[PDB]
Amino acid sequence: TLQYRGQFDVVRPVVRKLVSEMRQNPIDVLYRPKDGARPDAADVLMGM
Amino acid sequence: MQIKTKGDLVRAALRKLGVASDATLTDVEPQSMQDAVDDLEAMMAEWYQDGKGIITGYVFSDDENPPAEGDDHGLRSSAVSAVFHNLACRIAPDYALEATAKIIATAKYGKELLYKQTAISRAKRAPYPSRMPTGSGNSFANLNEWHYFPGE
Secondary structure, eight states, X not given: OOOOOOXXXXXXXXXXXHHHHXXXXXXXXXXXXXXXXXXXXXXXXXXX | OOOOBHHHHHHHHHHHHTSSOGGGTOOOOTHHHHHHHHHHHHHXXXXXXXXXXXXXXXXXXXXXXXXXXXXXXXXXXXXXXXXXXXXXXXXXXXXXXXXXXXXXXXXXXXXXXXXXXXXXXXXXXXXXXXXXXXXXXXXXXXOOOSOOXXXX
């Protein structure tokens, strides 16, 4: 039979806050030349 | 049960009252039968307030059948003692008698036990009010929102 089942959320705001925090700080790859290699060995790969 | 008719109920009531029983050598006068049967019918009609009172299965005699005496009472086996104790208590003043303390206590206990089961049955909880939601827990699958199904 049917009884009252509410949803009084207390976890979703925390999830939204964490998602916003992780969205405000984007992270992307950064190619860096190896030791002893040509100084701009990563320009083409970075462009691609 | 050996008690199977209004006459048997009346005889048991008179035997409790000590008016007409073999233990007192007394026999039932014919005119002490009809008056007690009328008293029993009045009591049962008063109890069964057109179905809104005590339910016992008692069979109410009609006009077409001439003899009210000798008809099956129709009570269940668990109501006979209460019915005839109450009958004795009610018809005691006819003979300017007074039903003794044990008879009165048994009558009270029997009436309470008679209505116990119907009280349990009628202890029902009303449905949900007309301004409640069902909550998202119930409405997340079918968008019911504002309906409690009258299941039980």
